[PDB]
Design an enzyme around this catalytic site. Structure first.
Site, short mmCIF file in Angstrom:
data_model
loop_
_atom_site.label_atom_id
_atom_site.label_comp_id
_atom_site.label_asym_id
_atom_site.label_seq_id
_atom_site.Cartn_x
_atom_site.Cartn_y
_atom_site.Cartn_z
CD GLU A 1 -4.09 9.48 2.70
OE1 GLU A 1 -3.77 9.40 3.87
OE2 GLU A 1 -4.69 8.56 2.10
CG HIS B 1 -0.86 8.48 1.78
ND1 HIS B 1 -1.62 7.32 1.81
CD2 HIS B 1 -0.46 8.70 3.05
CE1 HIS B 1 -1.74 6.90 3.10
NE2 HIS B 1 -1.00 7.73 3.89
CB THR C 1 -5.94 8.01 5.68
OG1 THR C 1 -4.64 7.48 5.41
CG2 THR C 1 -5.91 9.29 6.49
CG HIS D 1 0.42 10.44 6.82
ND1 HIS D 1 -0.57 9.68 6.19
CD2 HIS D 1 0.14 11.73 6.62
CE1 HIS D 1 -1.43 10.51 5.67
NE2 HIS D 1 -1.07 11.79 5.91
CG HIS E 1 2.94 5.86 5.75
ND1 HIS E 1 2.70 5.79 7.10
CD2 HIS E 1 1.85 6.44 5.21
CE1 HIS E 1 1.49 6.25 7.35
NE2 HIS E 1 0.95 6.71 6.20
CG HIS F 1 -1.71 -1.22 1.41
ND1 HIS F 1 -2.68 -1.60 0.49
CD2 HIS F 1 -1.67 -2.17 2.36
CE1 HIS F 1 -3.22 -2.74 0.86
NE2 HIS F 1 -2.62 -3.12 1.99
N1 LWT Z 1 -2.27 6.77 6.81
S1 LWT Z 1 -2.26 6.76 8.41
O1 LWT Z 1 -1.12 7.46 8.92
O2 LWT Z 1 -3.54 7.20 8.89
C1 LWT Z 1 -2.11 5.05 8.89
C2 LWT Z 1 -2.96 4.14 8.26
C3 LWT Z 1 -2.95 2.81 8.61
C4 LWT Z 1 -2.14 2.36 9.59
C5 LWT Z 1 -1.24 3.24 10.23
C6 LWT Z 1 -1.22 4.62 9.87
C7 LWT Z 1 -0.38 2.77 11.36
C8 LWT Z 1 -0.78 3.79 12.40
C9 LWT Z 1 -1.75 3.32 13.19
C10 LWT Z 1 -2.15 1.93 12.83
C11 LWT Z 1 -0.94 1.47 11.98
C12 LWT Z 1 -1.32 0.43 10.93
C13 LWT Z 1 -1.55 -0.95 11.61
C14 LWT Z 1 -0.45 -1.80 11.46
C15 LWT Z 1 -0.22 -2.86 12.33
C16 LWT Z 1 -1.12 -3.13 13.33
C17 LWT Z 1 -2.26 -2.37 13.47
C18 LWT Z 1 -2.47 -1.30 12.61
CL1 LWT Z 1 -3.94 -0.43 12.87
N2 LWT Z 1 -2.33 0.99 10.05
ZN ZN Z 2 -0.79 7.68 5.88
#
Ligand code: LWT
Ligand code: ZN
Length: 257
Positions: free
Chosen positions: A104, A94, A196, A117, A92, A62
């Site tokens: 975003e 986008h 997001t 981010h 990371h 992603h």
């Molecule tokens: N675009 S962002 O910055 O809003 C974003 C989007 C998705 C994810 C992350 C950051 C990181 C931050 C929190 C959860 C983690 C990730 C996830 C991975 C491993 C374990 C749980 C989780 Cl939820 N998913």
């Molecule tokens: Zn992000």
């Protein structure tokens, strides 16, 4: 048939596996600069990245994530709208297929070429997995990228991307200093929101910097050579990995006049 950014599995589909996609505090949002209110009680942000320990860079299918050692207070975000101490776990980006899209968040409906981010978790919850279950679990520092002059502090990231072209590839990535990705000003907007991407959890205090960083056309072109697919699968370029602006529903606060 898992989520992604295509016609058949993109953002307009996510609500079927993740109903919180239609929730009350989803991200990103459009930042209407005239409607945001200056909050003179907001504190300056404290970004303490001098002891940051980067470990690895990962293509997760992603985006690419630069991961940090978060087993001690070593790179932390505090102050601003935050109560307590948030530890840097990863950053990371986008980005778009074209320079006119990729961010975003938007600013008065303007899209930037990309968005960084920097993800942090509230240390009162002990681990990241516990923090994402809490309404104040995460703080994400969002920084816009525009195309112009190169960002010299980005080039070490650009140059490793050939080694993580495809989904599931990782590379050692030690001694990377995330201070080299920060604009001059820490003026920001802030609002309560969400992840997001799935699982779209409503656990984020968003802090979006007003000043973009400039990157070169060659730097962002290298982001666009990454792949969503795994090795030995049909090539699909990793571009347009952004969720569009979501309804604001029930206030964006500005740190500045
Ligand atoms: N675009 S962002 O910055 O809003 C974003 C989007 C998705 C994810 C992350 C950051 C990181 C931050 C929190 C959860 C983690 C990730 C996830 C991975 C491993 C374990 C749980 C989780 Cl939820 N998913
Ligand atoms: Zn992000």
């Amino acid at each position: 048939h898992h989520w992604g950014y295509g016609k058949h599995n993109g953002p307009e589909h996510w609500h079927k596996d993740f109903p919180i996609a239609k929730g009350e505090r989803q991200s990103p949002v459009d930042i209407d600069t005239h409607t945001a209110k200056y909050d003179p009680s907001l504190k300056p942000l404290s970004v303490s990245y001098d002891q940051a320990t980067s470990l690895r860079i990962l293509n997760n299918g992603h985006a690419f994530n630069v991961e940090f050692d978060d087993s001690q207070d070593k790179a932390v975000l505090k102050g601003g709208p935050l109560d307590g101490t948030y530890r840097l776990i990863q950053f990371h980006f986008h980005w778009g297929s074209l320079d006119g899209q990729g961010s975003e968040h938007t600013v008065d409906k303007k899209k930037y070429a990309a968005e960084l981010h920097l993800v942090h978790w509230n240390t009162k919850y002990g681990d990241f997995g516990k923090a994402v279950q809490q309404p104040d679990g995460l703080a994400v520092l969002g920084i816009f990228l525009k195309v112009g002059s190169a960002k010299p502090g980005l080039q070490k990231v650009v140059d490793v991307l050939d080694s993580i072209k495809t989904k599931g590839k990782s590379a050692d990535f030690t001694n990377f200093d995330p201070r080299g990705l920060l604009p001059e000003s820490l003026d920001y907007w802030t609002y309560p929101g969400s992840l997001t991407t799935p699982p779209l959890l409503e656990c984020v205090t968003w802090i979006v910097l007003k000043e973009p960083i400039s990157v070169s056309s060659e730097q962002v072109l290298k982001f666009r050579k990454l792949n969503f697919n795994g090795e030995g699968e049909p090539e699909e370029l990793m571009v347009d990995n952004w969720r569009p602006a979501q309804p604001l529903k029930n206030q964006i606060k500005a740190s500045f006049k």
